[PDB]
Design a protein around this ligand. Sequence first.
Ligand SMILES: CC(=O)N[C@H]1[C@H]([C@H](O)[C@H](O)CO)OC(C(=O)O)=C[C@@H]1NC(=N)N
Ligand SMILES: CC(=O)N[C@H]1[C@H]([C@H](O)[C@H](O)CO)OC(C(=O)O)=C[C@@H]1NC(=N)N
Ligand SMILES: CC(=O)N[C@H]1[C@H]([C@H](O)[C@H](O)CO)OC(C(=O)O)=C[C@@H]1NC(=N)N
Ligand SMILES: CC(=O)N[C@H]1[C@H]([C@H](O)[C@H](O)CO)OC(C(=O)O)=C[C@@H]1NC(=N)N
Ligand SMILES: *[C@@H]1O[C@H](CO)[C@@H](O)[C@H](O)[C@H]1NC(C)=O
Ligand SMILES: *[C@@H]1O[C@H](CO)[C@@H](O)[C@H](O)[C@H]1NC(C)=O
Ligand SMILES: *[C@@H]1O[C@H](CO)[C@@H](O)[C@H](O)[C@H]1NC(C)=O
Ligand SMILES: *[C@@H]1O[C@H](CO)[C@@H](O)[C@H](O)[C@H]1NC(C)=O
Ligand SMILES: *[C@@H]1O[C@H](CO)[C@@H](O)[C@H](O)[C@H]1NC(C)=O
Ligand SMILES: *[C@@H]1O[C@H](CO)[C@@H](O)[C@H](O)[C@H]1NC(C)=O
Ligand SMILES: *[C@@H]1O[C@H](CO)[C@@H](O)[C@H](O)[C@H]1NC(C)=O
Ligand SMILES: *[C@@H]1O[C@H](CO)[C@@H](O)[C@H](O)[C@H]1NC(C)=O
Ligand SMILES: [Ca+2]
Ligand SMILES: [Ca+2]
Ligand SMILES: [Ca+2]
Ligand SMILES: [Ca+2]
Ligand SMILES: [Ca+2]
Lengths: 387, 387, 387, 387
Amino acid sequence: VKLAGNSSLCPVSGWAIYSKDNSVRIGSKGDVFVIREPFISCSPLECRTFFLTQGALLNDKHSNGTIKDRSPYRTLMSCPIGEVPSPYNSRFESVAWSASACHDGINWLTIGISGPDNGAVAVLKYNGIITDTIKSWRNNILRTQESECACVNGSCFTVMTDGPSNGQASYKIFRIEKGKIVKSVEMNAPNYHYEECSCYPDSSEITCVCRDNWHGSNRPWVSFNQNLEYQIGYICSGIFGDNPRPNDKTGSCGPVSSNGANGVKGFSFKYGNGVWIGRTKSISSRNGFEMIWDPNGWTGTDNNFSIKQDIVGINEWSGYSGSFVQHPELTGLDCIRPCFWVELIRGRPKENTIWTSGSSISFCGVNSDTVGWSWPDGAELPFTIDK
Amino acid sequence: VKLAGNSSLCPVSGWAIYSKDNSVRIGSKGDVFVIREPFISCSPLECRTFFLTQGALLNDKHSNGTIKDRSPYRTLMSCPIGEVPSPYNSRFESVAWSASACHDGINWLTIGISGPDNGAVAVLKYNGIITDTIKSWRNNILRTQESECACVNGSCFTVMTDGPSNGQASYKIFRIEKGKIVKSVEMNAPNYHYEECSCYPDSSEITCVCRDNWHGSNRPWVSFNQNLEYQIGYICSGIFGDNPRPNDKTGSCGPVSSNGANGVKGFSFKYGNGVWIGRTKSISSRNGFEMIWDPNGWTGTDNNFSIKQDIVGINEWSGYSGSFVQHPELTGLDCIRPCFWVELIRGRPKENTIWTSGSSISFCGVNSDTVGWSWPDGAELPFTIDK
Amino acid sequence: VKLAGNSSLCPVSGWAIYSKDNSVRIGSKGDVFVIREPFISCSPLECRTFFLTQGALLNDKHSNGTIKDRSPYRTLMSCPIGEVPSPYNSRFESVAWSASACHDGINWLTIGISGPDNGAVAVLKYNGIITDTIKSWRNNILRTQESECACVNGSCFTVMTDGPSNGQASYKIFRIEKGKIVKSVEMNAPNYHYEECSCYPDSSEITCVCRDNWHGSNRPWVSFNQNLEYQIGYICSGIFGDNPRPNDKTGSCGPVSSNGANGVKGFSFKYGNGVWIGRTKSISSRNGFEMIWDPNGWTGTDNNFSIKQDIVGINEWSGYSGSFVQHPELTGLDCIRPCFWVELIRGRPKENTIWTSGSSISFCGVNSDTVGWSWPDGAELPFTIDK
Amino acid sequence: VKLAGNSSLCPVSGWAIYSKDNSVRIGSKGDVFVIREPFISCSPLECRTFFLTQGALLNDKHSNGTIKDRSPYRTLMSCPIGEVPSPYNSRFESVAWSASACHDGINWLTIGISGPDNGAVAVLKYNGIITDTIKSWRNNILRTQESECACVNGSCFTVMTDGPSNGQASYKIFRIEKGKIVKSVEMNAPNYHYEECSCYPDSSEITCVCRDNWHGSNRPWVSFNQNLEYQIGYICSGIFGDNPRPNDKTGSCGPVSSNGANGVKGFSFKYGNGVWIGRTKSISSRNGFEMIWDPNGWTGTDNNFSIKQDIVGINEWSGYSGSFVQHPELTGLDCIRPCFWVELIRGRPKENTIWTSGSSISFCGVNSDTVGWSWPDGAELPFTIDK
Ligand SMILES: CC(=O)N[C@H]1[C@H]([C@H](O)[C@H](O)CO)OC(C(=O)O)=C[C@@H]1NC(=N)N
Ligand SMILES: CC(=O)N[C@H]1[C@H]([C@H](O)[C@H](O)CO)OC(C(=O)O)=C[C@@H]1NC(=N)N
Ligand SMILES: CC(=O)N[C@H]1[C@H]([C@H](O)[C@H](O)CO)OC(C(=O)O)=C[C@@H]1NC(=N)N
Ligand SMILES: CC(=O)N[C@H]1[C@H]([C@H](O)[C@H](O)CO)OC(C(=O)O)=C[C@@H]1NC(=N)N
Ligand SMILES: *[C@@H]1O[C@H](CO)[C@@H](O)[C@H](O)[C@H]1NC(C)=O
Ligand SMILES: *[C@@H]1O[C@H](CO)[C@@H](O)[C@H](O)[C@H]1NC(C)=O
Ligand SMILES: *[C@@H]1O[C@H](CO)[C@@H](O)[C@H](O)[C@H]1NC(C)=O
Ligand SMILES: *[C@@H]1O[C@H](CO)[C@@H](O)[C@H](O)[C@H]1NC(C)=O
Ligand SMILES: *[C@@H]1O[C@H](CO)[C@@H](O)[C@H](O)[C@H]1NC(C)=O
Ligand SMILES: *[C@@H]1O[C@H](CO)[C@@H](O)[C@H](O)[C@H]1NC(C)=O
Ligand SMILES: *[C@@H]1O[C@H](CO)[C@@H](O)[C@H](O)[C@H]1NC(C)=O
Ligand SMILES: *[C@@H]1O[C@H](CO)[C@@H](O)[C@H](O)[C@H]1NC(C)=O
Ligand SMILES: [Ca+2]
Ligand SMILES: [Ca+2]
Ligand SMILES: [Ca+2]
Ligand SMILES: [Ca+2]
Ligand SMILES: [Ca+2]
């Protein structure tokens, strides 16, 4: 039965651990896909991990040069949450080097993007049957969330970007029903840069927090209702949420240009003026991960904050992070539950290997007791294939 | 419920990618089967890849000599589409060095041929229970589709061949109900040659686009109704569909004698006088893949066409291709949906290995935007076991 | 719903091939159990392979010594017919160095004998739950069918043997209901020897063909009814069933003493005074396999016969062989369908390895065309673990 | 339906072997989790083995140092009884270096503890959804059963411990409904020590037999009803159940201090004044396992017993052990069947390897015959990774 999507977000005081797959540790001996850009999505029955394979296994030669982002071998697959991504336990979803997925309560919708950099095509599938396509309109790397899309009342919403990664690009919001694109809209957003949006449903409204690769080290947000009427802004908190970023100082309601180029995929959950900010501990590279509660972070520009929970220690490897939710239909609760995941990138460029891959951890928001710790990857690199 | 088969083949403008298994790249380290002759068939609930294994895993010594077509070791097996053929995720079907399979909407029918070239016998299983057999009637390598068979309203149809591959052979058309051969017609087709027929339902009638190993570098076709009343012909288009073949020029409505000896198994979708042709990019070897829409190719003999979509690059290994459909029962559509797959042959006789295996890719037709690319095998040869 | 057991054996002219797993070949790389004593039994829904693992993998140090018949590491496991027996696809049944299994149409019954040679205990499970045991009554290797028990009207029947192999031992029949033993009878068989019976239902009565390891080169048989009233004898046919055996001569209704010591597990199907005989092709060793129809060979001492179908050629390894049946409730037929499996033993003591394991092929009785051939194991010995 | 747990515990005279996984043997070559602390729990439909992985595989470098008790890499996982703990056959439960699990008849409840030693948080999942948490209240290694919690009429019960391992600590009992902690009680147990309780239901009440790591060589117990009203004491039998322990002699209803320090997880079944004691055969180290019937052991301090049964030999490594039950809803009996499992520890600290892992065996109480034997782990150490 379809997901109502009309409840508010559970107010949550801390983050309890939900999963860890240990993929790279196990992959040293096991048959584990080289993957990256992993994410989690839940259905009214199960929660799955979705990932982009590199069409190759760990500690094998075809993991050579897998730092590369796009190829015709990359595919989106999924497995149950907490299990290593394996040829022997993973469902095939689509051929993709950029992807999103979610479940309307009835069926899985997956969006996979493959093809040339200047002509990429997005394949929408509803219950594994192709239902639509969307072709690149700016002819410069069509790309999407690498996180769950968001479903409200039988409709599913996503953001896509085409254009430069180092200047003004174009951003469309899609509304999908049964894998059919039924409405789209181009955000008129001069000086904003949106990428890899982390989008969640909250009171029949979608909110997305994204990646400014052009010139923002804080995150841009876009929010919109079912009719794709949208609002936009930047998270005003001087506790910056991108990577790279400056040391915390007074923030902006626009893109903080200082250390704003490049970035990483991230998320934040909005509660009124308050915001839960997921972020790396290191300001210069993908190490560490922490969760911060700033009661005025969404719209205030100061950097004072209340709560910090540690998730990955400063000296340990992190990467992408995304939001995922559990709906009352699955949870039984009166509200939609905030969760987040963290990719733990290993290999190139930071380590001396011929390959890049990641594992994952995940957390769900609660009001009961919670603890900070460090849950890093744990693999001893380099592996045998590097010698 | 059983598949109606009564609707018309969906009009398609371009092909969107559906699956890529990366079977060979992953076979480097993983436990994957040496396979060839893969193909895809759907039930109303799921789509599956079928394949003949060589009863052997990749990068093991038992892949030695796997260029050989027939042995008592080959078994027909299947796994969910897009996944790698591994003995951990594969379902056993039959013992076979030539096969066919299809689902009538109720249960899977499979046909596996094994035994000596002198008098091989086909075994028919319905829900995995032997339900009929048929023995060679010319004592010269009884062989069938290596493709999905077609089903319309409870009856399933396939095409078998017995006899020379380099001259006149015998051709039988079968009607199969619940696993039992209930009718067969011997085809009166002197100077026609049919092997490895790709067959699909289209308005309660079946169309087969097959291979002429004898003396045609265009493709033989046979249409028939439920009572196995048939019409035979050849694809008239000057965009010759076989491999090997001559350069494109004036077509013929009989077999195109030039470079007609030998062949690859292939497919085509008929649309009035038009034809959607899928073929190799090279005219001399199993390399490259492309779809061509010839608006008059079924009946006309020019080599003119209106659309070309690139599937596999010219310089990269391809091989077999075959048709498959997705019925309204599976899709919700009011038409039978045309799809296809391409086997990607690796190793012998073209490459310096001790083995021959294949990976697969597949596409389904749409009217929405699409793009041509190259989605090749990707593995680096030779492997550890060749060295 | 219960297996009826009330219908007759299907008359069958020949044997169509049904499964081939390629276990030892695949085991050269893939993670495959070293097993032996495999056998097939079918529920009214699926057919499974039961095997006795040695609790080790192929090509690993622990396969060392696997010629050993008994140990505390041997477990009875289960996998889908034709698939390779591995930790990744097999189901745990019982701890066992001698076993039996059969489905009554409601649930699986399993019988797993383990423990010391001088006081073994058979554990009976019904639907995975233990439901009875029985202690050795002769304190010399309590041992049983190594092949499917036969079921009629909700009761399941088996034969077990306890005592010496070099002479006269003791033999009991059992009627098991819901995994409870409800009746047991000791066969009064002075000068008969019974081991590893292949038992099949047929017109509500059980017929077992067994193994004389003591002094009989033709095969002993017990027939009984639902009340365990029984008749015994030997297969009269001059076509000697057991191996080792003499060359074919005139036979006897009692134990043929010429080459009567030792033996191999085997099977045969009775049809009136006729008999279908499955046996090795060699008279000295476990090589070859062939099926033979002697229309009077059940009661007639003549060495004539009218059908010989090749299964495994004389120069190839074979070994154990048993009967398995398929009931109407699974096939929709109007009778009980005979089928058999052959185990293909590789390694010690005939081949220079540190291990003994085996693969399996199976056939089912049909009335349409069949051919004979050779379907051997086909692995190249010795393995890496032997070098 | 939800388990009643109102029947009494089925009285038994011996223990028949139920399952053996052969983990470390299979792990030599195959992809098997480095684990420890395994336990069995059962739903009304199936039986599963839970285990605490070390986020690594046997015979891989990542198993290095796996003698450490707690780490971020440790996760609670489960698989079907008797299958090896594999990335390919095993399910993710939660992240845990301490755990319990049980099934109320409707859904699996899991508890996983992770975090710092001074801050560990127990996360509770019901059907894989986080439903509660409980944090360390004494800041000293929060820990739980390492076996199945017991279930009664929709409520599940567990015991937890926080505090010193070598002195007075804090013990608490919990009532869990659908994953919600509904009631908890702190035991007033001065001069007692509780850890790793084995808890079973018996006539709508809960009996836990535990471990005194402080100063007790016999095991403590705590019985309680659904309302969390409890009585406490120590197993009075002079046949001591802990390890290390001193020589069997006269017992005590309080802490027997000789060798009292330290211990090993165990179990025992109460039968009026009678006790079924499971214990290692060595008094100094985890070697061997035996079952012993002391008809007055619960309340009488003499060291006489009626039955002893050999499980694992003295010259073989044992390890942990615990109870598990098979409710009438699963077996069909009218009592709650007692069953136990034994962890067979291999590697450090007792052997020359870099790793530690455990295999397992299980037994079920019967009334029919059994046999004493020795089903030891059977692996040949060291492995290649230790060389
Ligand atoms: C489509 C694509 O390649 N997206 C990139 C992403 C991208 O380059 C930046 O956002 C710039 O626009 O960089 C990130 C990254 O790790 O920084 C990897 C992504 N990899 C893939 N999704 N495969
Ligand atoms: C039964 C059989 O061996 N069919 C052959 C096929 C055939 O020989 C030609 O069509 C000539 O008749 O050639 C093709 C081929 O790749 O050319 C491989 C097929 N291999 C398998 N189907 N196994
Ligand atoms: C219980 C037992 O050990 N059965 C033996 C069997 C036996 O030796 C003969 O029947 C003689 O008594 O021979 C066969 C055999 O290979 O000849 C192996 C069996 N091995 C196993 N089933 N484990
Ligand atoms: C939570 C924890 O660390 N538990 C320890 C346990 C513990 O040290 C003792 O009970 C005393 O406090 O000892 C046992 C043990 O081997 O004796 C291993 C346990 N390993 C795991 N549970 N992970
Ligand atoms: C939300 O959706 C439910 C289910 O359709 C509906 O009954 C209810 O009216 C809505 N309640 C709110 C405002 O959350
Ligand atoms: C990876 O690639 C480079 C060239 O692209 C090559 O030099 C190197 O040997 C490769 N590594 C492996 C192990 O294949
Ligand atoms: C949900 O879906 C239907 C689709 O027609 C729509 O009409 C209705 O307004 C929606 N109800 C809500 C917002 O709960
Ligand atoms: C064939 O197609 C028509 C139109 O879709 C449908 O109404 C009819 O039920 C089908 N016929 C049969 C016999 O199933
Ligand atoms: C395969 O067999 C060939 C002979 O055809 C032999 O030359 C080669 O060494 C073999 N390769 C392997 C690794 O088995
Ligand atoms: C097998 O057994 C023998 C005798 O114990 C031993 O010496 C040999 O090395 C073993 N082979 C293995 C374990 O590879
Ligand atoms: C256990 O509970 C069930 C349901 O209330 C009941 O039918 C049964 O008799 C009970 N047994 C007792 C009370 O011992
Ligand atoms: C395990 O631990 C020690 C210390 O890290 C190291 O010296 C040793 O080489 C390791 N062993 C392996 C094979 O990883
Ligand atoms: Ca940035
Ligand atoms: Ca040709
Ligand atoms: Ca004999
Ligand atoms: Ca005769
Ligand atoms: Ca103690």
